[PDB]
C-alpha cells in the first residue's frame with residue numbers, strides 16, 4: 001500500500017458506505033457494514049439452527065479449529081463477501097436521479113479520492129481479501145486466496161485469476177485511504193464477531209471453499225430480503241449512528257425469523273432408534289430387500305455409497321429411506337434430497353416422504369415441509385394462495401452482468417420460485433436434474449454443491465441407459481464423495497461395469513486410497529462401500545417376484561388392428577396402459593382409439609384417457625389426479641380403462657395395470673415400464689380372467705427383410721443402436737422369466753457381446769453404422785468436456801473450476817447446455833392465453849397487462865395456464881417471442897412466453913400451427 005494515511009483518515013466513520021439502495025417508495029438505504037453484519041448473522045443462525053451436526057463437525061475438521069471458531073470465522077467470511085463495495089467504482093454506481101451527488105460529497109468529506117473506473121464488486125472483494133486476510137488476520141496466503149476467490153464468486157461465478165490479478169484497474173478498487181476504510185470495516189465486523197484472539201482457521205481445501213462460496217451466496221440472498229432486513233437509513237440525507245453489536249443482535253433475530261419463514265428450522269431428529277415396521281405402518285412383513293437393508297443399517301459408516309438392485313415393485317424406496325433415517329439419527333446427517341427420475345412428478349413421492357417424516361419430526365412438518373419441500377408447481381401455487389406474502393422476495397442484488405439491481409434480485413429470486421428451490425430446505429423432493437446440474441459449468445453451481453452437502457442423497461430409480469450414455473452421475477458422485485455426502489442409489493438392475501464405475505467415482509471423490517475390488521453377489525443384491533469396508537450382499541428374491549411374463553409383438557401391418565386387439569383383450573374388462581415414446585404418437589394413437597372406446601367409466605369420466613407433460617398445468621393436474629386416482633395401490637379402480645401416455649408413467653409412479661402395451665425402447669426402460677404391470681398383489685383377485693396371466697405387448701418397428709426401421713420419434717428420443725440391441729434381444733422371446741431375466745436382458749444389451757447371429761449384410765451395416773454414430777457422439781462429448789463440466793474435486797486451483805462463459809449472465813441452464821449433455825430436452829416455458837381487444841387475456845376472461853409485474857393472485861392464475869413446450873418444430877420460433885417487460889422483472893414469471901390462441905383455439909407460431917385441444921393438449925400441426 002503506497003499511500004500514507006493520517007489519523008484523520010483513520011477516523012473515516014464506517015457507516016457512510018452503502019451496500020443496498022432504494023428506488024421508488026423506499027427513499028432510504030442500507031449501510032455496507034449493516035449488510036455485512038446481516039449476512040454474518042444469517043451465517044450464525046444457519047450454524048446454530050439449520051445445519052446438520054455432521055456438516056459442522058466435518059467443516060470444523062477441515063478448518064482445523066473448534067466449532068465456535070469455525071462458526072465465527074465462517075460468519076466473518078460470509079459477511080466479508082461485499083467488502084469490495086467499499087470502492088469508488090461501486091459507491092459511484094449510484095443513479096444521478098437518486099442522490100449520487102450526495103454520496104459523492106459524503107465520500108469527498110472523508111477525503112476519499114474519486115474515480116470513474118468501473119469493476120464488479122465481488123472481483124474487488126477477492127482482490128482486497130486475498131491480501132488483507134493474510135497481512136492483518138494472520139491466515140496463510142493460500143487460505144486467504146481461497147476465501148477471497150470463493151467469497152468473490154458470490155454473484156454467480158468465481159473470478160478468473162486474471163480478473164483479480166491482471167485486468168483489474170487500481171483506480172476502481174482504490175488505495176491508501178480506501179484500504180484504511182476497508183481495514184476499518186473488516187476490523188469492526190471481526191470485533192463484532194469476536195474473532196480476536198481466536199486461533200486462525202485453515203482454508204486450503206479447494207472443494208470445501210468451493211461449496212462454501214455457495215453458502216455465502218445463499219446467505220447474501222437471505223440478507224437481500226427487505227421484509228426481514230429493512231434498510232437502516234431512512235433517507236439519503238443522513239448517515240445513521242449505530243452500535244454494531246446491538247445491530248448484530250437485531251440482525252440475528254431477523255435472520256431467525258427470515259429462515260423460519262423458509263422452513264429451514266427446526267428439524268430436530270428426535271431420536272429414537274426406530275425399526276422399519278414403525279416408520280411404515282402400512283407394511284406388516286418387510287420385503288427381503290428391506291430386510292437386507294435393515295441388516296445393513298446397523299453397520300453403515302458416515303460417508304458411504306450404497307447401490308440397491310432389486311426387481312421393480314419390491315419396495316426399494318422404504319429401504320433407501322431406512323438408510324437415510326439411520327444416517328440422520330446415528331450419524332448426524334439430518335437432511336435428505338430425494339432425486340426423482342427426469343420424467344417423474346414430485347407429487348406421489350412427497351406424500352410417502354411426508355408420512356415417513358411424521359415419525360421423526362414434530363408437526364412443523366405440516367407447517368413447513370408441505371409447501372417448501374416440494375419442487376413442482378402445485379406447492380408454489382398453494383403457497384401463493386395462502387396468506388400472507390409467503391414467497392421469499394429479494395431486492396438490491398447487485399449482479400453486474402444484469403442491467404440493474406432489481407433484475408439481479410429477480411434472477412437470484414428465482415431460487416425461491418423455480419423448482420430448484422426444492423434443493424434449499426433440509427428435506428426436499430425433486431428431479432435428479434437439479435442435483436445433476438451441480439457438475440455443469442453454470443451460474444451458482446456452488447450453491448447446488450452446498451445444498452447437496454448438507455443432506456444424504458437418495459437417487460430414486462437409476463436407468464442403465466442413462467449411466468451408459470452420460471458421465472453426469474459419475475462426476476456428481478465424485479463431488480459427493482469429496483463432500484462426505486452419504487448416497488443411496490436405487491435401481492431395478494445395473495450392468496456390473498456400471499456399478500464398478502459409479503463406486504469408483506464416489507471412491508475417487510472420497511479419496512479412498514484402497515483399491516480392493518467389489519465382491520461378487522447374485523441378483524437381487526445390495527452393493528455397499530465405506531472407507532475400510534466394502535460389501536456385496538446377495539439376498540433371496542420375494543416369491544411374488546417369481547412370475548412368467550408373456551411377450552407378444554404387434555407388427556406394423558397389425559398396428560392399425562391394435563385397437564381391435566385391445567377390444568378382444570379387454571372385452572371382459574380390465575385396466576390397460578399404452579406407453580408411447582413421444583407426445584405426438586400418444587395424441588395420434590389416442591385419436592385413433594377414441595373410435596374404439598366411446599364409453600364413460602364408472603367414475604363418470606371416459607374409460608379412454610391421455611397423459612403427457614404438454615398440457616396447461618391445471619389440466620395436467622386434473623389428468624394426473626384422475627390417473628393416480630384410478631391406478632394407484634389404494635385407488636378406486638375402474639372395471640375397464642385404457643390410458644395412453646408418454647414416459648411420465650414409465651418413471652417413479654406407483655401405478656398398476658392388468659395389461660401393458662409399449663413402444664420399443666432400451667430394455668431397462670421397457671422393464672421399468674413393465675414394473676407397472678401387475679405391480680400390486682392386492683389387485684390380483686379382481687383381475688379379468690383374460691388378463692390373469694401377466695402379458696407385455698411391444699409395438700414392432702417396420703421390418704424390411706431382417707432389418708428394423710425405427711420410427712423417427714423414438715429415433716430422436718433414444719440412441720438408435722441401443723434400440724437395435726434391444727430389439728435384437730427381445731425379438732425371439734416368448735416368455736420372460738422374472739426376476740433373473742431382468743438382469744439377464746440388461747446385462748445382455750449393454751454388455752460387450754456383439755450378436756449379428758448370421759443374419760443379412762444390410763443388418764450388419766445398420767449395426768456398424770448406428771454404433772459408429774453413438775461412439776461419435778460419446779467421443780464428441782468427451783472432447784467438449786472442458787466447456788461443459790466443472791473440474792473434479794482433486795483439482796488444485798480454486799480458480800478455473802469454472803471457466804467461461806463467466807458472468808454472462810445468466811447462461812443456460814435448461815435451454816442450452818442442458819441439451820448438449822443430454823441432461824434433459826431443451827424447452828420453452830409458455831402461458832396459454834386467449835386473443836381479444838385490449839391485448840391478450842385469460843380464458844375466463846380477464847385482461848392481462850404484460851407491461852407490469854403480476855400480483856400474486858394474477859401470477860397464480862397465469863401460472864395455472866403454464867406449459868413446457870419442448871417440440872423441435874416450434875421451439876425456436878417461440879424463443880423469438882420476447883418475454884414481456886413486466887414478466888422479466890417478476891421472479892414468478894421470468895422466462896415465460898405468452899401464447900395467444902384465438903377463439904378457435906389456434907395460434908400461428910412459425911410456419912407451424914399450434915392448437916390447444918381439450919383432450920389432446922397442445923398440438924403442433926402442418927398448415
Ligand SMILES: Nc1ncnc2c1ncn2[C@H]1C[C@H](O)[C@@H](COP(=O)(O)OP(=O)(O)OP(=O)(O)O)O1
Nearest residue numbers: 283286287312313314315316317318461633654675
Ligand atoms: N415391504 C413391502 N411389502 C409390501 N408392499 C410394499 C412394501 N414396501 C412398499 N410397498 C408398497 C409401497 C408401494 O406402494 C409399492 C411399491 O413400492 P416401491 O418403493 O415404489 O417399489 P420400487 O420403488 O422398488 O419400484 P421401482 O423399482 O419400479 O421404482 O409397494
Ligand SMILES: [Mg+2]
Nearest residue numbers: 317460461490
Ligand atoms: Mg423406485
Ligand code: NI
Nearest residue numbers: 082121155398
Ligand atoms: Ni454482492
Ligand code: NI
Nearest residue numbers: 019035082220
Ligand atoms: Ni451482498
Ligand code: NI
Nearest residue numbers: 220396397398
Ligand atoms: Ni449483493
